[PDB]
Amino acid sequence: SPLAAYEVDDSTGYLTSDVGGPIQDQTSLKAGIRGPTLLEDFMFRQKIQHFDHERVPERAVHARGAGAHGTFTSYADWSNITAASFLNATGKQTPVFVRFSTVAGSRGSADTARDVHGFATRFYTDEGNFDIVGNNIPVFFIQDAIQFPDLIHSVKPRPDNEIPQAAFAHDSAWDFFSQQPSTMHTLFWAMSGHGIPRSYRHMDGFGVHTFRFVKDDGSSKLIKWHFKSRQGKASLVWEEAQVLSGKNADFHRQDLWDAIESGNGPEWDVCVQIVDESQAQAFGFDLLDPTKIIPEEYAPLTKLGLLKLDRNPTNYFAETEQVMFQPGHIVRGIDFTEDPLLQGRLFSYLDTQLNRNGGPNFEQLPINMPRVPIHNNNRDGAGQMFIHRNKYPYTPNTLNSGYPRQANQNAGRGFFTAPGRTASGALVREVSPTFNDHWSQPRLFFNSLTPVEQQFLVNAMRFEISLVKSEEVKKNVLTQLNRVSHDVAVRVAAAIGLGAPDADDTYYHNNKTAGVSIVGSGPLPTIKTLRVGILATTSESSALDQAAQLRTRLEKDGLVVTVVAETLREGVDQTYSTADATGFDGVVVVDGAAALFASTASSPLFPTGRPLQIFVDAYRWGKPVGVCGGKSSEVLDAADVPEDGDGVYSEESVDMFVEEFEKGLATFRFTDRFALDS
Amino acid sequence: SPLAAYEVDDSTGYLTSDVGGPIQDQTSLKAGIRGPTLLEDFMFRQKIQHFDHERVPERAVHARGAGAHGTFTSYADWSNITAASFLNATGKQTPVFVRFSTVAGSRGSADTARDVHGFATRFYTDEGNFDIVGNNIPVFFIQDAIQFPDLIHSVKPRPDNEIPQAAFAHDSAWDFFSQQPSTMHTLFWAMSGHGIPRSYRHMDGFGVHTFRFVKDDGSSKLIKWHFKSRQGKASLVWEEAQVLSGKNADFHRQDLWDAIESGNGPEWDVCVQIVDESQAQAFGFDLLDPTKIIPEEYAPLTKLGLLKLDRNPTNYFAETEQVMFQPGHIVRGIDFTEDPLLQGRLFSYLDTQLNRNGGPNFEQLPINMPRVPIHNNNRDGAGQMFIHRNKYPYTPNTLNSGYPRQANQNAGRGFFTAPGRTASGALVREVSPTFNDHWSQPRLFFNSLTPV
Amino acid sequence: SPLAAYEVDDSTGYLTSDVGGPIQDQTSLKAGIRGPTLLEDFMFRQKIQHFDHERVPERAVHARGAGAHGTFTSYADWSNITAASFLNATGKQTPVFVRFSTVAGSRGSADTARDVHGFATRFYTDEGNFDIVGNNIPVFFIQDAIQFPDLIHSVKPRPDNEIPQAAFAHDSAWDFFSQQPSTMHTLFWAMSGHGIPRSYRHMDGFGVHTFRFVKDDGSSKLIKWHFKSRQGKASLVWEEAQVLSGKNADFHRQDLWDAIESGNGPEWDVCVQIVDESQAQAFGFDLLDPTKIIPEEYAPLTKLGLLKLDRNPTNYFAETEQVMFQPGHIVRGIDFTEDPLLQGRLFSYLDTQLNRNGGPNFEQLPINMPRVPIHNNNRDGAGQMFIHRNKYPYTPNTLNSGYPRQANQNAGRGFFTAPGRTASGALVREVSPTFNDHWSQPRLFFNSLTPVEQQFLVNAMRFEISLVKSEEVKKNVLTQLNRVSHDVAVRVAAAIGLGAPDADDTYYHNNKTAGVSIVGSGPLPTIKTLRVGILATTSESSALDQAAQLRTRLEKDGLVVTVVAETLREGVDQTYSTADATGFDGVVVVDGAAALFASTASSPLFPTGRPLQIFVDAYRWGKPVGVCGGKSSEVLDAADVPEDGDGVYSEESVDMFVEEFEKGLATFRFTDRFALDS
Ligand code: HEM
Ligand code: HEM
Ligand code: HEM
Ligand SMILES: [Ca+2]
Ligand SMILES: [Ca+2]
Ligand SMILES: [Ca+2]
Ligand SMILES: [Ca+2]
Ligand SMILES: [Ca+2]
Ligand SMILES: [Ca+2]
Ligand SMILES: [Ca+2]
Ligand SMILES: [Ca+2]
């Protein structure tokens, strides 16, 4: 590890300059005690120059994100399908670093914005660094990389005033979507719960593009990468996500960090779909088109190995901010395809690192270094950290005995382009007509959602599109939505007071696919790390005792428990003033606290009606909620919460309450609380 | 627009490269209709290279902010207290640009966080650009610029995990405040409604530091700048600010934008407290200490002129993101004081623009340019736009007839340091004992608030 | 070995990317064998991106230079005059790196231009890096750092056409000198032999400024740094320097490299003049004025230790090009003075490294690292290598238990400003009248040169000034020269078509000072590394035999021998076609080769007259020359060289030839061959 060698320990010692001279740094050098500061104060200038130059350009996209270290372990020797060394043996472990992100917001923007999300994984393999630079949605908005600035300019804030930070809440974004129909598949995903995942740990990762697996014999197959969450899939509800974006802008980065610090590091099965070269157009669409998925019914997933994140960074800036991913970081055994979105990406990520790093030696940053020797004739450049011994860095040479040697298919384990690949035809700036069906798969995705999930998507569209000022853009939007689903266009049109255009059934169908729905993916497989808010009072010794009782039990089941009361003390984590339902996955009121709720209700220590509002919000947003200890009635009545409601608990027995409530936490959302269009 | 000369119109025309060759930009050049992309596709590369390099480093502090253009109008001829040209005639008008901001959060952090706020004003005067780089709170946390990184590291997110955004909600910030008691006065202000103003239009601007006004005869007085809102002061309530941060992270920038578009451009009376040099220690504290206000009961405000913001930018990046303020942008008639916070600032803002701009010619960006001619011997550097005719850029010269000439108090309307300033004593890294009362003024402030 | 941890070996292995993936780099990936190159060719792009970004800005001055590693060893414990740790014990060793340079030319300009030269030394001390950033001339052109760009613009090429390279050969430089008379002292130095040293090893190093030595008790003394060459002082003659600029632009860098490779690493005694603070104005000038020396007659040198350079770099770019010196790299025991030239330097060198390195972490380059631990709260910035474990990098803190601790005079061996220093008075942009005598010291320096040396300086002035177009500028130059010396003005004026102004005796005097003359500094103390060219012929096996004999005699004494003949073979190093007298410190003809020695001598293998012209040029340029074997007349008469001349040798006996000739090498130059004005 190059990271270990560069760890700097400041737990002891006297302050020094960056050249080891002991110094101070608290008072400027001045000509007399009330005098002007001196130019000769080097202590001052070196410290302030450093401060003045701390910042580097944020990423052009995916600026907001967070990372962690961990380990990938192969489940088998996969030699039969790829020459990739990291996959060549059962149990082979390779270090990883992952960064997760949103796409459109700047650094500092909230984690819980509605957006596409990044899931970028570096495997520090024994034959070079291999990056899979993925998203949590398996399809992308556009079909050619040259369009990327168009898409991004359209979704980022309007450039006269840099308003708004909400990617989908403005005219220009919808102008682009409605004029560029390829966008429809990703737009439907982004309008689903996949736009507001519950956490990084509760989403999947996709390579998006078709890639190749290449064997040592030169043969190739076509693959899609799928990183399948072992935590289960889960989303926020929209109103919850909007509150969260104010109450805790760092919600996802904090959820990740805390899960790793508690020993609950997240896991994914790294999987592929594998198909033959001859099936490039067999599935009703072109595998070069990054706006299409291969339905799992046509190509099942094969599990290749386990990805686990189990260590946090030491210095966020040095590790997370400076990690520089590239789809060009490929290894023997993997190759590209002619997907025009992937093709252009290869150029963009090598170039943009010059912008961020300010010089060409970015791969020498510890987080970017490989874990094998580097042998090449790259030299000089700003920020050169190596002292190269070889004074004849050219090929061919005799003066260094012909080293470094060329690597290729038959030497040195070289990378090699899949040798079956060809190209033929004119040199064209033309779109393949095989790419032209922009609507069937959006409809496939929509069909595969549950009824209340369909409602949530329609409601997201109603919310966002109602913020578009231009009537002409809104009509254009309905034109495209209607090519996917007339019912979607009708329902969305109703909220914005326009008429939907008449049904156009060209692309309509009733087909469905497995594995895309959040609401239909079933209870979570684990409730470890999920958050329980226990609403108590310092008024009643019995209330605090009840909360402590609940705590001990819930904690041994891996839940993160917060006891809330008017003021802090022994056993109480959070005041009502700072508490919010967005902080919890379930809320329990201890019945000793009934007085705070069954009330209007007033104190200089928190806002009027806060305790009840926490419970009310939690219910409205679908969470398991309950009252533990004796007389539920009054709290549930004060909240207008029905005691017979699914995911509403009322028990005197602490043990029965915990059992029932824990089943609620796995269910995670009670969707019968949300109204549906008739 | 005052930057009309630099505008580029794209309401008509065919797409071109940056060198005027008509091109397309929607499909990559490929070897066959389902083929790989070609390296010879210059259309693709020049567009993507530009996109790849769009971003520049955010400001080290005050990263989150918004700006507008306007006009300053002097109420009087202020010659009898300052030689400043922009203040030398009743009704004299000078263009301005102002940027408002928070302090701690990054780009895209919400407007309605609890924080200190910036209020930075550029006057494009007929004798040079003059910047007053102020905040909405009249006192600062610390008493020496060398401590700035300490303060800022402590309020910014913890550096292992970059949590939390939200300057005051974590241990390190309160560790620093409690170890560095100078911070109490600004801390009390930030914990008041001044930490969550209703808009940029409903807050005041303060230079914080004592500065000097200098007359053409060389006499000086000590001043504090106060920009007093004509919209009134108003705050959010905290609960509301928290919900707004989520519902509308752009709330202050939109409020300002909208007010200008509707013809309600915000206004401030630009004022000063003026006191004699003999009064530097007369008010029971030291006027060099930036943690203290001069109570208005001791020195009333004089209104100098009107600041009105009435024109939004054309391109946010080019104007607002790229504007580069400096307290060293000073003009004849103003001078510095030995406030050790101010003193170090003068170094920081000139250096940090190298970081943002990536080269030394940042004064050439349209928003940074002055509105009068430039005559000097600065040359070259990355990004040099100017084509200088003078092929002898050194002084003293005879081969360019001794031009440019030196400007000073007696010739050429030069800047000059206030000639009554002196220094005396040991060269010390010592804090004046006159700085040591960290608590009385925070109590003055608290006492001055209503009960609620 | 001092930077061994950063070394990269490429003597074995297969080529890899920068992230360790084995690759090739000799053929682009193409769509067919005669097809266009593919964007997906990451091998191509990463290699070419690196190439495209290899260059960094050259230094703003001193762009042309060369460097080496070495060791400093202290002669004593100097705690009686300084707290500095590297000087605190007899025998104490500290690693060093030195870079030597010219000043005006760009990084590809010739070594042997007439110029001021740099001598910058880094001591990697056990209390931090300490740099002495000196020159080979003890005084500077200007008295205030603010004037630096005026000076440098005036000497660098005219900015319309970037002509001429060659600092003194144009109007603007002499315009500046004549308008800014402070320049006279350094000008007279640069017009002497000190402007064209024979090698970096044959020049001294000076700090120029008065600095302070500060004891641990707080008391201070004023010092000047003098690095006195143990190789002796030596110059080129001007015509020779001009020829060398064309025949070997790398002459000084090669001389240094070679001396080190041969185990003849150059040495200096590091010395100071030490005077009391009360003697700031006692010597008839102000010690804050960098245009003045303290004559050695008023303040003798104290030898502090030995500097020896003995290891060449491994990678020039990484070590020599990237070394970033600063006078701000100061250590406890040393302080600044209020010299206004020094004061502003402190700002310049910290700022300019942002330009060169392109980011703030330049102290992390291996050559710039200290050799002790770094403990501070500087963070982030582009190119940040360090992974800092202290997540509370602010002072004051409790969450990192108050570390790093402040260092100062009384704790932690902090740097401290000399506590006796004060300032008093108005804040002014005024020059001290104590700086106003710009002419007395130039006259002192001129008076201390020998007659022939004064002639050489006049002749350099005549050469350069005659290239100034402007008759006004020429007139103004003679006004200033005449204030130093009427006779200089007269003699210069005679070459350039003008009358000198009448004598103005205000600053005239006859005082002299020791240690500044080159011609007067006596024979060299060592002749090891000096170059002897033996001119032979392949047309007589006897001539080669003589050459071989002489070679062994000369090599025994550490001279570097080149045997020249018409064509190469074993024992012959160089052809006449490539050889030139600039290549040698002495020239010997073996008498077996006498037939070659005619201006008549014609051949397709070398220019007509070449063998003889080497001998004639050597003679004209002052060098020891002779004929070995017993028959000298034919060669000597062809050369018009008299047999009884001083530094002309003729002997049959090889031993007796060599004994005589080695005395001539030590004398080095026979100045009786140069005409004097009468
Ligand atoms: C399938 C389509 C894509 C996926 C899945 C994807 C994914 C991502 C991810 C996850 C990141 C963030 C990596 C990190 O965490 O540091 C990112 C950054 C970026 N992407 Fe993409 N991307 C796609 C398409 C594009 C295209 C078409 C372009 C350009 C033509 C592009 C240009 C960029 C740039 C310039 C960055 C910033 C990289 C950096 O500064 O390190 N991407 N992408
Ligand atoms: C009286 C105390 C201070 C006030 C009122 C103040 C005000 C501000 C304001 C308003 C801005 C943003 C300007 C804009 O909108 O672009 C800012 C930026 C900045 N300030 Fe200060 N500041 C203070 C003290 C300090 C100190 C002590 C330092 C450093 C020693 C410092 C360094 C900076 C830097 C580096 C920036 C970013 C500038 C840029 O990138 O253009 N400030 N300051
Ligand atoms: C006593 C007067 C001076 C001496 C002896 C001197 C010496 C030198 C030396 C030897 C170097 C080259 C160091 C190396 O080899 O890398 C150099 C570089 C330089 N000097 Fe000076 N210098 C003097 C005055 C000035 C002044 C007054 C300034 C500016 C105000 C200045 C600015 C620079 C700059 C900008 C560089 C390039 C540094 C780099 O890129 O690392 N120097 N100086
Ligand atoms: Ca818009
Ligand atoms: Ca959902
Ligand atoms: Ca290949
Ligand atoms: Ca903290
Ligand atoms: Ca308020
Ligand atoms: Ca010239
Ligand atoms: Ca000489
Ligand atoms: Ca740069």
Author numbering:
A (entry chain B), C (entry chain C): 21 to 698
B (entry chain D): 21 to 472
The authors write:
The E484A and T188F variants showed a decrease in turnover by 53% and 48%, respectively. However, the turnover numbers increased for the E484A (sixfold), E484I (fourfold), T188D (threefold), T188F (fourfold) and T188I (fourfold) variants, while they did not change significantly for the E484D and T188A variants. The presence of heme d in the T188A variant and of heme b in the E484A and T188F variants was also confirmed by crystallographic analysis. Although the K m value did not change compared with the wild-type CATPO enzyme, this mutation had a negative effect on the catalytic activity. In the T188F mutant the solvent distribution in the upper part of the main channel is very different as the phenylalanine protrudes into the channel, while the lower part of the channel is similar to that of wild-type CATPO. This is due to a shift in the position of Thr188 (in the E484A variant) into the channel and the corresponding Phe188 residue in the T188F variant protruding deeply into the channel.
Catalase (CATPO) from the thermophilic fungus S. thermophilum is a clade 2 enzyme consisting of four subunits, each with a molecular weight of 80 kDa. In addition to its primary catalase activity, it also has a minor phenol oxidase activity that is capable of oxidizing o-diphenolic and some p-diphenolic compounds in the absence of hydrogen peroxide. The highly conserved four-residue loop located directly above the hydrophobic lower part of the main channel in large-subunit catalases is thought to act as a gate allowing access of H2O2 to the lower part of the main channel, while reducing water access.
